[model samples]
Target chain A: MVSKGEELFTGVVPILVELDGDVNGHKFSVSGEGEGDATYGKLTLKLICTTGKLPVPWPTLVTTLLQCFARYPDHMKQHDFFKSAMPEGYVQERTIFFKDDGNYKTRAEVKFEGDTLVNRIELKGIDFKEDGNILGHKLEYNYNSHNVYITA
Target chain B: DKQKNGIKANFKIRHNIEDGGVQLADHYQQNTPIGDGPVLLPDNHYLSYQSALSKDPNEKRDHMVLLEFVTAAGITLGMD
Candidate 1:
């Protein structure tokens, strides 16, 4: 029998991110779990890497979530706070890292409990860019899922 | 197929707009439409007569350049 997380993570949902009122294609949500609450929903997201590869200066999964749903464009602007919140799921073994790009690694984790469904995403050995200046910061996504699909 | 003989093609130009002005009260002054009033330029004017000069007339004579004998009224007349 599939776990509650596995059941919720069923179906191909769109993994998109909005930037400046334009929804850019991110990854394609392959599957998820069912019966997950608003705050706590455990699920898996298989990142759709182009040609099985990731793009540079990757945004966090949470940033993508906020971009897709958040009303205010600048909502959740502080990425570092989101990064700190991401480690909780990692520590709990709820998230898992799978694919590896040139120098960066693609990871996925599901966090669920009360009223949010979070898919904490992170990257390893990445070289990020700041204001067009290539910096040495890694990419991480600490996103929460609210009003997720409960019945399906 | 492009020939490697270094000989350029010939172009026949035709144009109009009087060979001269009405400075004199003559029909010639009014300027009769010549044989053909066509325009020619450095790229268009090709001297087919110069092809018999050498394997490469341009390589032999420094002054053997393509000349589109232009009229005083600013009209390019084609070369031989």
Candidate 2:
């Protein structure tokens, strides 16, 4: 029974990135001055994972992912660097959650840019799931993204 | 293949380059984070073994000393 906010919160909770992705690589920026009159916007992040890295029993990989999150909180914090730089209430908080059909889906809600900046953005659906069990072992994953759109 | 181990480390507590030993968990402060410790390899006594790679042509064996030290960092150095 997760509200949109709670869901996005949970989905983003897992180790946001690891061995394969930008976990230890290049830095990422959430920036774009696109349209001053723009009331809606969208951004996405890429994540890659593998069981070979964890090589553990049930929830070990999941636990390790959680540990990674607890280890670094700012990178995944709400209204990250770019959003935080905005004045007091410039950006509103939306939803964050995941859908578990067999795997987890990633999603988030965010406020957009505008003179009034009053537009409200809602979470649609960001599918995140384990594609298939590879060779009857490893969990095969598809590209999971954090699709955020600002609304007017 | 990766093997699982509860192995953990944080260098902050007490890092001594002369000792080449990264203080384990207990040496850390109550609320400090792990892997933040400064390594103590520079002052390591073993470094002398490395310095032994003098101009001596027999310095071939002296190279092993440096190899062992840097190997811990997953690296190898060659002297021409």
Candidate 3:
């Protein structure tokens, strides 16, 4: 049987914290689990790492999501998010990391619409974790944003 | 966006529903729109600030991004 998550939440979920720290030494600032802005994502990661397998700041990551989505835009119901607002009952998972083993795993458990999800964005935040080394820097976070996101 | 602190459109897209997708303004990964404007994902994109802050009444507004969709084709399908 497909298990269903009992916790259903929605709107302006507060920030887990004003996260700021090192990424292989490159300092980064993550805006908390605040409301979703059209221009930025939850904990809009602000870091500039042009080293290792993943050389990224923000735009590169965004490029990954959009380009990837564009390729599969017709999957769920044949209406990519770009053409219309999300309908309901579908789940979209987005993951971005900087390690070969997926250490700094930051992902989105997107499932909602309008203000229903409290401007909801899954604790979709990046964790410095055992996340490898970038620019000779290692990213770190206390409890990871998504863990905090689901707690609500 | 700054001309000296301004911004300009860096991308262009063609509005054609290929199955269930539209072309972006950027090169190959153009995601936002103007078939009215569009963008951002936890994963993101660019829609002109001008395109977004338009004054033309009667024209559909632009959307920088969607928070998420509960259940819809676009949401899940786009994850490929």
Candidate 4:
């Protein structure tokens, strides 16, 4: 059996989602606001994905997406960021360790003016899947309204 | 004319610069959900690449999620 939250959860989405400043991205808010806002951006972030990129074998892509989705939700809730409201002028950092040895980490600083808003999700990483050799991908996002999409 | 791959589904993923956001268009137009990961093309996917530029919903099904990104070169250096 499946439900709706699956589409928005970083779980089914396949990645470690950390947010600072404002957020309009996922359905679940780890530590920020906007529970299920669409087209997330501005604010700032470090959306981490292990096994990196895509276009791998169906099984590999499926496995990586599932593992990250399975892990991050439970992990974020207990973390300090979710417990305490984000502070102004600085973006905090969170470190996640998988398999007991990988150096998967996240850090960012986010600040905003009156009425914070996020309006986009930059697919900042694709060599990610293109080169057939992607360990992890680090993406940075900012907002304007629209900044165009895709590349060759 | 589109030739089908025997087994390994071969295709390409590309994008275009739009007014407000980036649109992900690829070679294979498969029914891939936003977060479920890329679609697994069958032996016969498509011959060439296609953009998400079609007016009809049925033909404009190459994109995954609405999230987007672009190369810095394309944005700043004028090179990609």
DockQ winner? 3
Model 4 lDDT tens row, A27-121? 21122122222122111122222222222211111101111011112222221111121112122222222221121123333222233422112
What would the per-residue lDDT of candidate 1 be over residues A28-116, giving only the tens digit for each residue?
A: 23121222111221212223333222332223222122111111112112111111221122211112111221122333343333434
lDDT of 2 by residue, B10-62 (tens): 12111111224221111110111122222111111110001111122453321
TM-scores, chain B, all models? 0.15, 0.13, 0.18, 0.21
The regions of model 3 sitting more than 4 angstroms off are A1-56, A59-90, A94-102, A111-152, B1-80
Identify the CAPRI category of the predicted complex in candidate 1: incorrect
Off by over 4 Å in 4: A1-90, A117-152, B1-80
Residues B1-80, model 4: lDDT tens digits: 11111111222222222234332222221111222222222222111211111122453322122122211112222344
TM-score of chain A of 4: 0.24
Docking class of 3: incorrect
Give the alpha carbon lDDT tens digit for every residue of A86-114 in model 2: 21112222122212212211121222223
Tens-digit lDDT track of model 1 for B15-48: 1113321111000000111112221111221111
> On a 0 to 1 DockQ scale, where is model 2?
0.01
Best by lDDT: 3
Of the candidates numbered 1 and 2, which has the greater DockQ value?
A: 2
Per prediction, fnat is: 0.00, 0.00, 0.02, 0.00
| Better by lDDT, candidate 3 or 2 | 3
Q: Where does candidate 4 chain A have its weakest 10-residue lDDT segment?
A: A59-68
lDDT for model 1: 0.21
Which residue pairs in candidate 4 have backbone atoms (N, alpha carbon, C) closer than 3 angstroms, thus clashing? A11-A69, A91-A109, A122-B68, A123-B68, A123-B69, A146-B20, A148-B22, A149-B22, A150-B15
